[PDB]
Amino acid sequence: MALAISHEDTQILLKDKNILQESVLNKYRTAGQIAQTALKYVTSLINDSYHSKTTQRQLTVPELCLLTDSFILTRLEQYYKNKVNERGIAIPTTIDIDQISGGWCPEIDDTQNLLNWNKGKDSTFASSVTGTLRPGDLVKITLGVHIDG
Amino acid sequence: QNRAARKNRYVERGSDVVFGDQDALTASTENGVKLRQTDRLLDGVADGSM
Amino acid sequence: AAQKSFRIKQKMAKAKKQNRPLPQWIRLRTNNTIRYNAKRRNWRRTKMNI
Amino acid sequence: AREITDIKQFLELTRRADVKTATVKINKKLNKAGKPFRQTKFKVRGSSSLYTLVINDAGKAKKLIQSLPPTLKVNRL
Amino acid sequence: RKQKIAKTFTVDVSSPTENGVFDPASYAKYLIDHIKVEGAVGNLGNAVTVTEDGTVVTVVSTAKFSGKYLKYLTKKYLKKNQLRDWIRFVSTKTNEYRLAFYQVTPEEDEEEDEE
RNA sequence: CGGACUACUUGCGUGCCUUGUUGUAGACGGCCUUGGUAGGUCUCUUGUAGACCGUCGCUUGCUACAAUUAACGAUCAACUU
RNA sequence: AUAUGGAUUCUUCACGGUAACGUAACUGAAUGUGGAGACGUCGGCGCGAGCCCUGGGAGGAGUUAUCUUUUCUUCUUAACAGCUUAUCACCCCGGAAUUGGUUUAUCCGGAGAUGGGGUCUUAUGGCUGGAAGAGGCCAGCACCUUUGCUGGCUCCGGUGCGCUUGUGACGGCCCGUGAAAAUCCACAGGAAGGAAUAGUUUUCAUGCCAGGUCGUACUGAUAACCGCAGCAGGUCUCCAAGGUGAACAGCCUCUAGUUGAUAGAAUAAUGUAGAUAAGGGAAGUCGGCAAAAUAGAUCCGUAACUUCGGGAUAAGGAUUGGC
RNA sequence: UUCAAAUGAGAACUUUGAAGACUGAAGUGGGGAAAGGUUCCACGUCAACAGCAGUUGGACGUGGGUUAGUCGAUCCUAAGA
Ligand SMILES: [Mg+2]
Ligand SMILES: [Mg+2]
Ligand SMILES: [Mg+2]
Ligand SMILES: [Mg+2]
Ligand SMILES: [Mg+2]
Ligand SMILES: [Mg+2]
Ligand SMILES: [Mg+2]
Ligand SMILES: [Mg+2]
Ligand SMILES: [Mg+2]
Ligand SMILES: [Mg+2]
Ligand SMILES: [Mg+2]
Ligand SMILES: [Mg+2]
Ligand SMILES: [Mg+2]
Ligand SMILES: [Mg+2]
Ligand SMILES: [Mg+2]
Ligand SMILES: [Mg+2]
Ligand SMILES: [Mg+2]
Ligand SMILES: [Mg+2]
Ligand SMILES: [Mg+2]
Ligand SMILES: [Mg+2]
Ligand SMILES: [Mg+2]
Ligand SMILES: [Mg+2]
Ligand SMILES: [Mg+2]
Ligand SMILES: [Mg+2]
Ligand SMILES: [Mg+2]
Ligand SMILES: [Mg+2]
Ligand SMILES: [Mg+2]
Ligand SMILES: [Mg+2]
Ligand SMILES: [Mg+2]
Ligand SMILES: [Mg+2]
Ligand SMILES: [Mg+2]
Ligand SMILES: [Mg+2]
């Protein structure tokens, strides 16, 4: 016979963590390397699209956020499989322009909504409204990667 | 029975780390209404002192 | 009466929309003398007479 | 819901150009006395009625399925 | 009038006998001395035969022997040996049956890394 | 020298099911067409196999038996006295 | 709105049956007739449906001190369509007293019975399609998540002064004979148009498009209505299980529903609602008031009087279980 | 009517479980017509009301809920106006 199973609904924290042995340092160093490579990749895309401007259309902020997040997940997918329980993105990719200090990551299905909602206003927020950068902008890029917490 | 006790073991999650011994992070809502639900008795007053 | 006329249903709809207590922001007005709704109606208390 | 006997009537009905769907339903049942046997029902959906052709002998059912027109959205079971 | 069909019935006793609370030889002996045929006990004059190979008890019958009667006799034997409240008699397919345990939840087993 | 990481990439063992294909399986009006089986019966432990009955079989020309023609005899199911 | 297919015709507007009539169709204006809508109540009889009862088998649950092949539960099939199915009624042959047929109930026949052969209404039932793919009853897995799956079985009968209900053919009753209109169809009529490269058909089959406005929750009552109230009052109707029994009486039970109505402790007198009482048997009281006694069913028996119909369960008697 | 647990500052009276009973199919069951008008349902919740109590409610506060070519009205006529 096999007996039974349950749901049990309650637990608390556990022990023997945050001591910084070699495996914890390996996880921290791997997360740091993935984050550095992602920042280099999104920097090269901004430079390619705006500081060379070869022949074609330029990338916008939602496309840059989408491509950076998919690159992060593609790189992280082959590290620490079936040995840790949780992985992925810790802070999503946010690109802020001058007055915006935190929290700008618009989805790819909201460009027409941004145009319709801000039709009527002036041009002080136009980089965030349309998605294209113009010269003279401070652009803040923020991202984060975790491995098992 | 020892096999079943070995199978039903523990495993803990990060939600149990960070959210165990925690209340809800939202307000009280003394009439018990939802987020986009009207409250015609208390819409015009926008501070709890008043 | 579960098979009624539009005239009866219209008066019932107005009497349903009139059945509310006093809004709380009205109590905070300058020289406010309304302290309660003195024309409140209840189904078992007093009848509408069609 | 109508029942069809003539297989030529079934073919000229399934070629009516206002049909779009036909189903083949297989159900296994018992004869007068002894044995189990398969039975295939062919249901073509018209605009006002559903027409059913019942084939008990499962040899010619495969021939009908093979010779059915290639445009209908045929649904098994 | 030559409808002398030989029905077969199979019972699987392997799970309680492997867990060590059942005895199929005693179960088969209970069947031989409590099957009634023409109203009388011990009238099994080549009408039914029951055999036991340690895992499957088989009845071959050419008398009035529906599966309800086999369930009735097995429940009576389990009551006599006080295994009702623990073991049930279920049908897998037609005329194949098995003994099963009722659902049991495990104990605590969390005292000084006991599990 | 380097591996903390499975991935980082044979075969060929042991097996699951669709199996694609036969092996196996051959499950059944095919009527290629004689004495009957649940036909009436009997040696045949029944029934077959064999026959007998000389011809059974819902049936019928063939004429006949208390023809169940004076119905006395064999065939299934309610509750009233 | 409309397009095909079929049907019709050069004998222009179809054929087949002695007939009752049949069919996938098979021109028909004005006008005029006919039918349906469209009808009381009671009585028994016949049939149909649902329920009730019951036998094998395949599942699930319970009892098991002793007994019980046991007790309970699941095993279902809509509108609609095709084929078929009837009491009544009608047609053909034939010619009836030794009068026959025939209903529970006595009516029918030379104005054509009995008999033989046929036609019709489709109430209603059956078999197929709808449709097993649904629903039901069980057995499992991952049973990680507010997420997902796979298997079996669902089958054959019986009965009846049963119960409720629908319906048919009859019968009784009346100085009582038991609505109307919208609406739909048919017939008579023969206006008018028409076949040869065609007209009629959308009353034959298939195909295309559309179907506006208002009501719709819940109670329907010992708390949603009216009585000033969350008042023992009042207020129209449908469905209706087992036993006992004549019974929709009373008593007990299944499905469903409720467990509401200020409570705790003691057991004085007097009450309200019930009961029993030796011997006597109305002596009580205005008055046998009230209570007791009687009581169902079977069988025997029954007076004066009478408007002859009744009185009448008159009066009186012998009985009643179980096996 | 009784027992335990849960909830709660507090439980004869709330919720679940365990028991004992009742209505007894001319029901304390399942639907509707007049009439009422949101009483339906969820969440929050106890000052007043529920002739004891109350954490409960047909109470108090905030919301959700009624979908038609085929069911009714609409159309017809009756006594009548
Ligand atoms: Mg007034
Ligand atoms: Mg013709
Ligand atoms: Mg009658
Ligand atoms: Mg119906
Ligand atoms: Mg209908
Ligand atoms: Mg009635
Ligand atoms: Mg007519
Ligand atoms: Mg409704
Ligand atoms: Mg309703
Ligand atoms: Mg209701
Ligand atoms: Mg009622
Ligand atoms: Mg009611
Ligand atoms: Mg009352
Ligand atoms: Mg009132
Ligand atoms: Mg009252
Ligand atoms: Mg009786
Ligand atoms: Mg009774
Ligand atoms: Mg006395
Ligand atoms: Mg006296
Ligand atoms: Mg005296
Ligand atoms: Mg005196
Ligand atoms: Mg008296
Ligand atoms: Mg007298
Ligand atoms: Mg109480
Ligand atoms: Mg009583
Ligand atoms: Mg009772
Ligand atoms: Mg009644
Ligand atoms: Mg409520
Ligand atoms: Mg509440
Ligand atoms: Mg109170
Ligand atoms: Mg109080
Ligand atoms: Mg409310």
Side-chain angles (χ1 to χ4, degrees), chain A residues 1-6 8-10 16-76 78-84 87-147 149, chain B residues 1-5 7-8 10-20 22-50, chain C residues 1-49, chain D residues 1-7 9-19 21-27 29-31 33-34 36-61 64-65 67-72 74-76, chain E residues 4-17 19-22 24-37 39-50 52-106:
Chain A
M1 62 182 311
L3 299 206
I5 201 166
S6 288
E8 175 84 18
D9 284 327
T10 49
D16 210 19
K17 302 281 137 65
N18 313 299
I19 322 286
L20 273 302
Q21 312 105 337
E22 299 300 319
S23 62
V24 179
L25 266 169
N26 272 131
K27 283 179 205 72
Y28 269 121
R29 193 187 294 124
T30 317
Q33 279 163 31
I34 295 279
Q36 291 270 50
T37 319
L39 187 49
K40 192 80 164 54
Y41 168 77
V42 69
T43 317
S44 80
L45 262 65
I46 295 276
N47 271 328
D48 200 6
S49 197
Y50 287 93
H51 289 156
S52 302
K53 47 186 168 299
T54 312
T55 48
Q56 74 272 33
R57 83 285 182 274
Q58 306 158 329
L59 308 165
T60 56
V61 181
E63 313 168 20
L64 281 145
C65 292
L66 260 181
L67 286 157
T68 314
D69 275 336
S70 79
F71 175 79
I72 285 177
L73 277 166
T74 314
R75 290 285 202 144
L76 190 41
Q78 65 106 12
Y79 278 115
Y80 275 98
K81 295 176 80 182
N82 63 268
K83 263 165 50 73
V84 303
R87 277 179 307 142
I89 288 163
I91 292 293
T93 316
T94 72
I95 287 95
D96 307 296
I97 324 291
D98 312 281
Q99 298 93 18
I100 292 98
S101 46
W104 195 258
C105 43
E107 289 265 332
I108 202 54
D109 63 310
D110 280 313
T111 84
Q112 204 55 49
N113 275 323
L114 274 178
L115 285 189
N116 292 325
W117 288 339
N118 299 272
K119 173 255 291 182
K121 307 293 199 243
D122 63 338
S123 49
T124 175
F125 279 116
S127 282
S128 297
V129 164
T130 75
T132 79
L133 321 165
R134 46 197 35 83
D137 291 16
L138 297 198
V139 171
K140 300 163 261 161
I141 299 106
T142 305
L143 61 95
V145 178
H146 92 276
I147 286 165
Chain B
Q1 200 257 322
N2 270 18
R3 213 166 317 172
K7 191 168 167 72
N8 289 325
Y10 186 51
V11 194
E12 201 218 0
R13 272 92 48 94
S15 61
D16 277 353
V17 182
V18 76
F19 268 109
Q22 287 276 337
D23 46 0
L25 50 89
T26 75
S28 87
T29 313
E30 81 176 295
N31 260 310
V33 308
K34 274 154 169 168
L35 180 84
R36 291 176 275 271
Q37 183 176 337
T38 313
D39 200 305
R40 66 176 176 193
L41 186 80
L42 303 155
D43 281 335
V45 193
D47 42 347
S49 65
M50 302 266 102
Chain C
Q3 263 164 341
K4 56 189 69 92
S5 43
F6 190 77
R7 219 183 283 279
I8 301 304
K9 191 176 162 67
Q10 203 176 11
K11 298 184 82 72
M12 285 160 47
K14 175 190 176 70
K16 180 210 167 47
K17 297 196 300 149
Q18 263 174 344
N19 202 21
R20 78 173 280 178
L22 216 72
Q24 294 278 79
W25 67 261
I26 286 172
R27 314 196 175 266
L28 305 164
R29 295 188 111 168
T30 295
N31 316 128
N32 170 252
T33 66
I34 315 293
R35 305 175 90 202
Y36 73 114
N37 188 14
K39 294 190 201 184
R40 189 85 184 270
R41 204 251 321 154
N42 195 259
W43 66 274
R44 215 207 264 267
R45 265 73 164 275
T46 180
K47 291 300 174 177
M48 270 200 265
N49 296 345
Chain D
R2 279 281 272 280
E3 163 81 4
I4 305 301
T5 288
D6 312 343
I7 312 183
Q9 188 199 348
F10 188 81
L11 285 155
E12 212 56 49
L13 198 148
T14 203
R15 258 188 322 277
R16 213 171 63 179
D18 44 24
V19 296
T21 43
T23 74
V24 185
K25 172 83 181 43
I26 295 98
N27 47 9
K29 56 178 67 176
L30 288 90
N31 71 306
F37 76 105
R38 304 244 299 265
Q39 160 184 279
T40 50
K41 263 176 205 178
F42 293 83
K43 328 205 187 179
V44 50
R45 189 48 168 122
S47 88
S48 293
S49 293
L50 170 78
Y51 299 87
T52 305
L53 173 85
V54 182
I55 309 298
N56 305 267
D57 180 40
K60 55 175 186 182
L64 268 172
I65 286 172
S67 84
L68 197 147
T71 318
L72 293 159
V74 186
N75 193 358
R76 308 287 194 176
Chain E
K4 298 286 103 176
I5 322 292
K7 284 214 71 157
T8 76
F9 297 97
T10 279
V11 186
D12 196 31
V13 304
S14 46
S15 172
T17 51
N19 265 291
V21 288
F22 197 75
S26 318
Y27 176 47
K29 188 180 64 77
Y30 192 91
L31 287 180
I32 80 172
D33 74 338
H34 287 91
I35 278 174
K36 262 150 89 155
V37 45
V41 184
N43 211 32
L44 270 60
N46 288 52
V48 315
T49 43
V50 52
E52 169 258 337
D53 64 351
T55 45
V56 165
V57 189
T58 311
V59 186
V60 168
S61 168
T62 171
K64 187 187 179 218
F65 204 73
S66 84
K68 294 269 185 64
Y69 195 23
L70 184 53
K71 180 172 204 191
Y72 170 76
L73 288 171
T74 310
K75 283 207 271 189
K76 188 172 269 296
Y77 172 80
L78 290 176
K79 183 58 167 183
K80 198 172 263 293
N81 281 260
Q82 288 202 26
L83 274 311
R84 287 280 266 155
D85 310 341
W86 305 106
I87 308 178
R88 74 185 299 203
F89 182 89
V90 279
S91 179
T92 304
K93 49 180 65 178
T94 303
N95 303 322
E96 315 293 286
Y97 314 97
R98 78 188 192 275
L99 279 312
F101 273 105
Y102 283 128
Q103 285 185 354
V104 166
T105 45

